[PDB]
Design an enzyme around this catalytic site. Structure first.
Site, PDB file in Angstrom:
ATOM      1  N   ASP A 105     -31.139  -8.679  25.960  1.00 49.39           N
ATOM      2  CA  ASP A 105     -31.513  -7.787  27.028  1.00 49.39           C
ATOM      3  C   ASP A 105     -32.856  -8.328  27.452  1.00 49.39           C
ATOM      4  O   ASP A 105     -33.793  -7.787  26.803  1.00 49.39           O
ATOM      5  CB  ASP A 105     -31.482  -6.392  26.713  1.00 49.39           C
ATOM      6  CG  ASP A 105     -31.655  -5.334  28.129  1.00 49.39           C
ATOM      7  OD1 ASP A 105     -32.408  -5.934  28.871  1.00 49.39           O
ATOM      8  OD2 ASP A 105     -30.923  -4.427  28.272  1.00 49.39           O
ATOM      9  N   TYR A 154     -32.358   0.988  24.711  1.00 48.73           N
ATOM     10  CA  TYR A 154     -32.442   1.524  26.140  1.00 48.73           C
ATOM     11  C   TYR A 154     -31.437   2.800  26.128  1.00 48.73           C
ATOM     12  O   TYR A 154     -30.276   2.716  25.344  1.00 48.73           O
ATOM     13  CB  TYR A 154     -32.212   0.485  27.308  1.00 48.73           C
ATOM     14  CG  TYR A 154     -32.010   1.420  28.592  1.00 48.73           C
ATOM     15  CD1 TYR A 154     -33.042   2.060  29.151  1.00 48.73           C
ATOM     16  CD2 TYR A 154     -30.653   1.402  29.244  1.00 48.73           C
ATOM     17  CE1 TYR A 154     -32.708   3.030  30.554  1.00 48.73           C
ATOM     18  CE2 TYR A 154     -30.469   2.210  30.382  1.00 48.73           C
ATOM     19  CZ  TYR A 154     -31.332   2.652  30.849  1.00 48.73           C
ATOM     20  OH  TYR A 154     -31.325   3.343  32.133  1.00 48.73           O
ATOM     21  N   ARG A 171     -13.646  -9.809  45.036  1.00 55.31           N
ATOM     22  CA  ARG A 171     -13.753  -9.324  43.679  1.00 55.31           C
ATOM     23  C   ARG A 171     -13.982 -10.677  42.643  1.00 55.31           C
ATOM     24  O   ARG A 171     -14.912 -10.718  41.929  1.00 55.31           O
ATOM     25  CB  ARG A 171     -12.616  -8.517  43.465  1.00 55.31           C
ATOM     26  CG  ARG A 171     -12.553  -8.059  41.838  1.00 55.31           C
ATOM     27  CD  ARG A 171     -12.284  -6.834  41.384  1.00 55.31           C
ATOM     28  NE  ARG A 171     -10.928  -6.810  41.928  1.00 55.31           N
ATOM     29  CZ  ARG A 171      -9.603  -7.390  41.512  1.00 55.31           C
ATOM     30  NH1 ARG A 171      -9.758  -8.267  40.665  1.00 55.31           N
ATOM     31  NH2 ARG A 171      -8.483  -7.094  42.409  1.00 55.31           N
ATOM     32  N   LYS A 200     -34.708  -3.688  37.839  1.00 49.97           N
ATOM     33  CA  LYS A 200     -36.006  -3.605  37.570  1.00 49.97           C
ATOM     34  C   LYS A 200     -36.776  -4.621  38.279  1.00 49.97           C
ATOM     35  O   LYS A 200     -36.846  -4.834  39.288  1.00 49.97           O
ATOM     36  CB  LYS A 200     -36.434  -3.247  35.969  1.00 49.97           C
ATOM     37  CG  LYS A 200     -35.295  -2.756  35.642  1.00 49.97           C
ATOM     38  CD  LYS A 200     -35.492  -1.199  35.862  1.00 49.97           C
ATOM     39  CE  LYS A 200     -34.047  -0.359  35.501  1.00 49.97           C
ATOM     40  NZ  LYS A 200     -34.129  -0.345  34.117  1.00 49.97           N
TER      41      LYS A 200
END
Ligand SMILES: *Cc1c(COP(=O)(O)O)cnc(C)c1O
Ligand SMILES: *Cc1c(COP(=O)(O)O)cnc(C)c1O
Ligand SMILES: *Cc1c(COP(=O)(O)O)cnc(C)c1O
Ligand SMILES: *Cc1c(COP(=O)(O)O)cnc(C)c1O
Ligand code: NA
Ligand code: NA
Ligand code: NA
Ligand code: NA
Ligand code: NA
Ligand code: NA
Ligand code: NA
Ligand code: NA
Lengths: 380, 380, 380, 380
Positions: A171, A99, A47, A196
């Site tokens: 972004d 978005y 982690r 993407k």
């Protein structure tokens, strides 16, 4: 040196131990310690850090000319980690058309935690300056945006944010590090849905964050370790792998985009076309100043819902699915798939007409994609 | 029927399509739609749902006798998703000695979002009743706890939470669904670090949440889709795989735990031993009432730091590493590894002496583990 | 339609069941049967067939315009499966300079099973006609070959094989299906080390075989099921993934190859250059007749061993490793790495001089690769 | 020390570099060399060696008290590698009832290469001594065998093979290294379909070979590198993982086997039962002398085909599928599924009656499996 070289040799993506020319997949959670506190290579719990995730973080830091990278289990996990840099009562300025997942997280999750949010048309940067409150801590912009590809001046946003003490965030999903590097333009933090273009093969859900700021990096690391939205090693490996071909893919996509836009502008069944390469596009000059290529997302208007559905059914090489940046070319109707919750008249007012089509150009042959869409448009 | 059978045949872990007797690994992000909105099997984007993740969610729902399951990229991602059911100004009661990552998230992340938190000794449930404020929304308990294995009455906590309108949550990592099922006892939400016993092989970092509550499940689903801390398909698959052997592993571990405790209580170099199976342990009767077996985590006192380090170096089969629930037996010194940030005198006051050792019993041979620890204790 | 389109949409690489746009990874060995003998989708045991392996087999059949595909655990496993079509006493004609692993398998393994082998210079096809014995069953050719890139006329080899009743086989690794399709030229069986260009990312060891012949396909299937050299599902998936970018990668590589050859021919520290694109190369016309592009493997002569080692150390973007067809550009010295077992004077006679360098061109920037090698050559 | 400990700590299954407590997955094909011929850790090409495959080879060598291990892409790939130690004209003695894939490979593939094979009832070892020809090179035995569990004296087979200069091979799949170690009994080579108990989760097709013989190991290594039937890294990792729980699984299975056999012998709808634990079983004493537990494969006779099919449909916890050694209990009818090609009367003569049922006991609850089969048998 040049970008296609940097894509192959940038970052640490070999094994120092065995010489493996690809990053080993550390499908592991914990690490032996030779003495209490003495970690052989800095690892103690996956982690907190995992060597495969570290590889992909190194890659995204390198490709964005940052210093620190972070891999999250999705783009919205990256975005939430960044937003969690703020405290209740703090205020964020975002571009009006962010978005839908960003909008949904901000207005339905983080406002319940006292984060204040204003959505503002940042295509004029002075609109940011007006929106600045005394509580404003963050400036978050996408450029270009979905689905209408509105361009925001990144360097001026950086200057504004610096002068007002704001953490600036871009972004950068739609452009990728291959064409646009917000950190080079003064931005504090850049992020991506690696789901993407970066992964590029429709087989990983992932987010990536880069920064050159040591103190912001410390805070992002603490958040990621405490809230735990970490990218697993197998997905980190597949990201590292997919990023190798990013330049070739983006460049094929860009060639196709130029030809497809010529076709769309010529065709009688098509009205407005939205893409930053069109010289009449708002802030075209700005985009060419901050980027040296184009996103593969195009939107254009056919007449109505039935025209759009006929288009989808008549294409052979455009696939109906969610997401973008695949090897396949994808086709979608925002008004039905991403903005169907907004009332119709608001949709119309915003530009999301029933016949608005969004394609994400893939890496099929340019001629095939031009010809396929045209013959489909010809059936209207 | 019986638990070892339910572990093998509970949940959906075959492929309906090909008949594959194991869950396929859907290393994919998006799904074809035959018509806009018509999903062949309900899938449209892997963040929202992925068929391998759905398999593991089905398993954890089944094993906890819940209705809805959720897989997150880590235990603390699950915990954060649950806490994000709350709004700023809402208040949470937790047991005083929660896992350090839970404490760190709550006090360093979520209080910055206006979540109020009180840590309370829940070994007496009336201590919960006193801590209830008008703003209290959630009751969150671990039982047994780390590293001193304090037991909290789950059924009474459920009753208290019901009577006061609280969402009740149990972190059930240490017991696993094999031995303790909080949902059967009235608890609203149960969660796990699947990093530990459930995955069971030290090779997955993951969290799992189960509930029978449709409305809580809707809210958890919305949070997980908006903040995006989702478990990937490869890790979901490895979880499904590791859970198959959970009963056998827990039962081997329990046999070893009984023998190791007899040895520890007999040995002169060992003072106090903490484990709920010891009949003098606080709330032993409670634990036996809510569980039909034991965790593999034991803590015991040797004399000081040097004794503890000698113990670690002298064992052959106890491995020094972070985490618990491996196939290997793990050994650690909380005062140096998990509570080294607390000042020494506070450590002492809390029971975290310098010579406090924590072992997580693995699945090695019982005699070897008993004998190995004894001969190591004999060297003090 | 056009090749880059066929690479994306050819073969079955989606999930019919869920709509997943990538092939699911069936990490499974056996399949449920609804009734004895009734298989839901044809699967009953992964050795015999596995749906992910079936996906990649479908791809290689499509890309080579064949009908049947086969995935093996390595290129030499594919080659051995093909050779096991023969019986003791049968005889094979191969080109004199076949890949060393092919030579080693044939002369050290299969001759112990009574397979007779003759190595023949097939750059003149009449040399094949002379080598034909009454026992000759198979004609096996690589074109172009390693490390001197000798070209063999595929269509004439096919005609010869047809007229004499020979199973004709082409090892098509160096050209890939993107540039050369032996099945279209009459060849019975085409194979590949998918370890090289097809996988393309140096992360899979695999072989692929394609045929249009139903009866040869039945025999290959029986051999593969009986001797069991099958490609696993994870590697099949990574092959399917890597093949998506094959056209883009090969075309980048070809651009670089043209420029690098101009540079090499100009440079004074370089003597002979071996590559089929050079018009003075033996059978250049033949290669251009059977292929529409070039392999990325080039060999050239520097003066001696020390020149070659200096070259390797002075490059920044050429990596010293085994294999070819990576995203990285690879560099090697055959005389030391692949032909060091042959006596020196035989090496010299064959063209494998001490200063013979082999590069496998990757997908880095063309200018960087040209400039990097030149400046390294300049240091001699 | 004791077996369950050796399963966890035997072999090399951690990362020396990072301390990872699980073997990294080297999804890689080639390795950087610092100088020509200088390999950082011995790796240069994954076909020849891969560090994850090396890990699993180390495990199987350790568990069989051998010195060298080898991982192949399937059990029949391992068997073929072993058989390829022979030359044309050499002769092999096998037990009459070997696994059908072994029989099929030998009689349909390797006899075409001049390998001579005789199938002999080795339950009397003097039958081996008679079968020895001057050309006999190999003695290959399974014990116990499928589907009638015939036992062969391993130590006497080893003595015979030593005295006559034979390479002795035991297929030890059904017993696993946990219960039977042929190398300790003088056998030269031991192999396994790791597809079955060792992997143990029906999700890997793999073979494993172990030997203490340096020269046989050199020849196996050369064969595996030349014919290329290598196990991939992902499957090697899943094998290493599944082997951790082998002792627990085998012991659960053995408890269930004892109870199920008591039930079967008592039931009126069941005639003969075949399993080496039954004291009237041929060579029961031999099996108890060479093994300290039992396989999970049982066969028993119901009356006819319709009884067998009713049994299959009436069970809730017995699954109809190919393979054995799953976590699930599997059920099959040899006469229809594995011996349907043999004429009926030959089947009958051999003991493969229409009502012969084979179960492979899994790790479900013992009582559930006993009760489920009984109530299904009660419906006849
Ligand atoms: C050339 C090169 C760079 C240069 O990066 P820029 O900032 O874009 O000039 C970085 N990394 C690697 C590996 C390179 O080869
Ligand atoms: C027996 C069985 C159950 C029963 O669950 P309980 O609530 O514990 O009785 C559930 N699922 C499966 C698959 C079972 O075999
Ligand atoms: C265009 C196309 C083909 C055509 O193949 P050729 O034989 O090269 O013409 C095959 N498959 C797909 C999926 C295609 O799109
Ligand atoms: C105990 C132990 C052994 C002993 O092996 P045997 O030959 O069966 O006695 C081997 N390896 C490990 C790791 C052990 O712990
Ligand atoms: Na690098
Ligand atoms: Na900066
Ligand atoms: Na089930
Ligand atoms: Na309830
Ligand atoms: Na297709
Ligand atoms: Na043909
Ligand atoms: Na070990
Ligand atoms: Na021996």
């Amino acid at each position: 040196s040049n970008k296609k070289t940097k894509l192959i040799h940038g970052g640490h993506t070999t094994d120092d131990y065995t010489g493996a020319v690809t990053t080993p997949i550390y499908q592991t959670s914990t690490y032996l310690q030779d003495d209490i506190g003495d970690l052989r290579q800095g690892y103690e719990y996956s982690r907190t850090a995992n060597p495969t995730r570290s590889s992909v973080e190194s890659v995204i830091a390198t490709l964005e000319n940052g210093k620190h990278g972070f891999a999250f289990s999705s783009g919205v996990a990256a975005i939430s980690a960044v937003v969690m840099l703020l405290d209740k009562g703090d205020h964020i300025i975002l571009n009006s058309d962010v978005y839908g997942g960003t909008y949904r997280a901000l207005t339905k999750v983080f406002t319940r935690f006292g984060i204040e949010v204003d959505f503002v048309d940042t295509t004029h940067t002075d609109s940011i300056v007006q929106a600045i409150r005394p509580t404003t801590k963050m400036l978050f912009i996408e450029t270009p945006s979905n689905p209408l590809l509105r361009v925001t001046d990144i360097k001026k946003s950086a200057e504004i944010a610096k002068e007002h003490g704001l953490i600036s965030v871009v972004d950068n999903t739609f452009m990728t590090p291959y064409y646009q590097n917000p950190l080079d333009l003064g931005i504090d933090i850049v992020l991506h849905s690696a789901t993407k273009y970066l992964g590029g093969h429709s087989d990983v859900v992932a987010g990536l964050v880069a920064t050159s700021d040591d103190k912001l990096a410390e805070r992002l690391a603490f958040i990621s370790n405490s809230t735990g939205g970490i990218l697993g090693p197998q997905d980190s490996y597949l990201l590292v792998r997919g990023i190798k071909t990013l330049g070739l893919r983006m460049e094929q996509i860009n060639r196709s985009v130029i030809e497809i836009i010529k076709m769309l502008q010529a065709h009688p069944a098509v009205q407005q076309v939205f893409h930053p390469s069109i010289e009449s596009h708002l802030n075209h000059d700005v985009h060419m100043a901050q980027a040296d290529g184009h996103t593969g997302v195009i939107a254009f208007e056919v007449k109505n819902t039935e025209s759009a559905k006929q288009l989808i059914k008549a294409t052979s090489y455009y696939t109906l699915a969610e997401s973008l940046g695949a090897v396949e070319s994808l086709i979608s109707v925002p008004a039905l798939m991403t903005h169907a919750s907004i009332p119709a008249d608001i949709r119309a007012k915003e530009g999301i007409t029933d016949g608005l089509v969004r394609i994400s150009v893939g890496i099929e042959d340019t001629e095939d994609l031009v010809d396929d869409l045209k013959q489909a448009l010809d059936t209207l």
